[PDB]
Design an enzyme around this catalytic site. Structure first.
Site, mmCIF file in Angstrom:
data_model
loop_
_atom_site.group_PDB
_atom_site.id
_atom_site.type_symbol
_atom_site.label_atom_id
_atom_site.label_comp_id
_atom_site.label_asym_id
_atom_site.label_seq_id
_atom_site.Cartn_x
_atom_site.Cartn_y
_atom_site.Cartn_z
ATOM 1 N N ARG A 39 0.829 -1.201 0.000
ATOM 2 C CA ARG A 39 0.000 0.000 0.000
ATOM 3 C C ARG A 39 0.863 1.251 0.000
ATOM 4 N NH1 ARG A 39 -3.877 -3.205 3.625
ATOM 5 N NH2 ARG A 39 -5.968 -2.741 2.811
ATOM 6 N N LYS A 215 -21.484 -18.362 -2.256
ATOM 7 C CA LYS A 215 -22.904 -18.090 -1.996
ATOM 8 C C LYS A 215 -23.623 -17.256 -3.010
ATOM 9 C CE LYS A 215 -20.769 -17.269 1.744
ATOM 10 N NZ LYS A 215 -20.284 -16.681 3.018
ATOM 11 N N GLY A 373 -10.892 -9.591 -4.242
ATOM 12 C CA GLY A 373 -10.903 -10.734 -3.338
ATOM 13 C C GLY A 373 -10.195 -11.981 -3.824
ATOM 14 N N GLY A 396 -13.981 -3.146 -0.559
ATOM 15 C CA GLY A 396 -15.391 -2.809 -0.330
ATOM 16 C C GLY A 396 -15.939 -1.759 -1.281
#
Ligand SMILES: O=C1N[C@H](c2ccc([N+](=O)[O-])o2)Nc2sc3c(c21)CCCC3
Length: 416
Positions: A39, A215, A373, A396
């Protein structure tokens, strides 16, 4: 809109300016030692451009850990200043606060064209707008407290550079309240906005979304939003068994089944038909007799279904063959989800072939965007990051952008 935002490269007047830069320095720190410097390294093009363009001061503001609107020196940015200094080959001045007359005095007193790192924004309740005191009582900043802190951050400089796309989904003081005339994206944020704009506004068609994951439930908003943009959608991974069970009454044995998500499968399929989107579900699976890489395995088609006590852990060879015409004829690809249990080498074939086809399409002119992800991890483990147009690190914020949600940090940037 996402593609018409002012970027650091469009800023003409930088020489002699105090440049305030919002960076993402939320790095893991283990007793003063930074374990991951990626980062910090990722902000170097932004810092170098500002030094090269003759900025008077390069003032960095960021957050790390979870102080919750209270000064908590476990989450001090002090070690980040030291690491950044080593990477720059010059001393980086670290200040114990981020607002006020003393911070302003220390900034002005600093060497010209130097880099200053201010203390963690989240030591102030006004950054997130809510927090928790030492005792554990909830605290909230009033509209006036928020406005005062935003005014104080604005007083630090002349030009604002937002290089923290990963926090742009939050209406935080440093994302929405820095009221300078020039509010431009840094290089990291510029790339994210440029590629997400290419994929979602006026994309080069056919536009394909490749979705996967364990999911259905946590992908409903993403799927429903992408059904308004894409021409084609591959649905794979663990979530596909729920679709096969609901749609074809296919036997799924001990494969993953999403009970809450199963109730929305028909709605999703109905929206896809309304929007004229072609849906590509697996027609065969590599099944296993135990959730393990050394399991006994075989291929079953969706006509056979999966027997009791067996579980589908990857797309089968026919489903893998079906990817070829779908991916290679696509001009824009949004990939968010692996097509099997890629962490187990024997169930990674479907995900690896999907990656090889996306790369092949990219070399021939397609724009490929990897959401993040698990898909980013797969691309990284396969060492193919440089073969994909854009691998998002927005976390996010990238997910909210793809779900069609408002990014206050993006909305607050200047227009080109
Ligand atoms: O934890 C699990 N996840 C995997 C998964 C993730 C993605 C996919 N895919 O098939 O793409 O499958 N499938 C099963 S069966 C299974 C488990 C999982 C846990 C123990 C009981 C049997």
């Amino acid at each position: 809109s996402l593609g018409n935002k002012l970027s650091i490269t469009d800023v003409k007047a930088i020489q002699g300016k105090k440049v305030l830069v919002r960076v993402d320095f939320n790095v893991p720190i283990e007793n003063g030692v930074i374990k991951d410097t990626n980062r910090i390294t990722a902000t170097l093009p932004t810092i170098h451009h500002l030094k090269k363009e003759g900025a008077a001061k390069i003032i960095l503001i960021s957050h790390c850990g979870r102080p919750d609107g209270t000064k908590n020196l476990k989450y001090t940015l002090k070690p980040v200043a030291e690491t950044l200094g080593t990477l720059l080959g010059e001393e980086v001045l670290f200040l114990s606060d981020c607002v006020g007359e003393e911070v302003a005095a220390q900034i002005n007193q600093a060497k010209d064209n130097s880099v200053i790192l201010l203390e963690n924004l989240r030591f102030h309740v006004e950054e997130e707008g809510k927090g928790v005191d030492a005792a554990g009582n909830k605290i909230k900043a009033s509209k006036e407290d928020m406005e005062k802190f935003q005014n104080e951050l604005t007083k630090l400089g002349d030009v604002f550079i937002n290089d923290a796309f990963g926090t742009a989904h939050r209406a935080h003081s440093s994302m929405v309240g820095i009221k300078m005339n020039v509010k431009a994206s840094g290089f990291l944020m510029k790339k994210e906005l440029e590629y997400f704009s290419k994929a979602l506004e006026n994309p080069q068609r056919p536009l394909l979304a490749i979705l996967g994951g364990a999911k259905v439930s946590d992908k409903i908003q993403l799927i429903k939003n992408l059904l308004d943009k894409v021409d084609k959608m591959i649905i794979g991974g663990g979530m596909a068994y729920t679709f096969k069970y609901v749609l074809n009454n296919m036997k799924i044995g001990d494969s993953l089944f999403d009970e809450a998500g199963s109730k929305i499968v028909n709605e999703i399929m109905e929206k896809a038909k309304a929007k004229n989107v072609e849906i590509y579900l697996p027609v065969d699976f590599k099944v296993a007799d135990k959730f393990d890489n050394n399991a006994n395995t075989k291929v079953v088609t969706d006509e056979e279904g999966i027997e009791d006590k067996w579980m589908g852990l990857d797309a089968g060879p026919k489903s893998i063959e079906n990817y070829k015409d779908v991916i290679l004829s696509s001009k824009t690809i949004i990939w968010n989800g692996p097509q099997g249990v890629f962490e187990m080498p024997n169930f990674a074939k479907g995900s690896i072939e999907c990656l090889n086809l996306v790369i092949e399409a990219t070399k021939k002119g397609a724009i490929s965007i990897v959401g993040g992800g698990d898909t980013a991890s797969l691309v990284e483990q396969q060492q193919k990051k440089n073969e994909i147009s854009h691998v998002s690190t927005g976390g996010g914020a990238s997910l909210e952008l793809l779900e069609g949600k408002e990014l206050p940090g993006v909305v607050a940037l200047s227009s080109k």
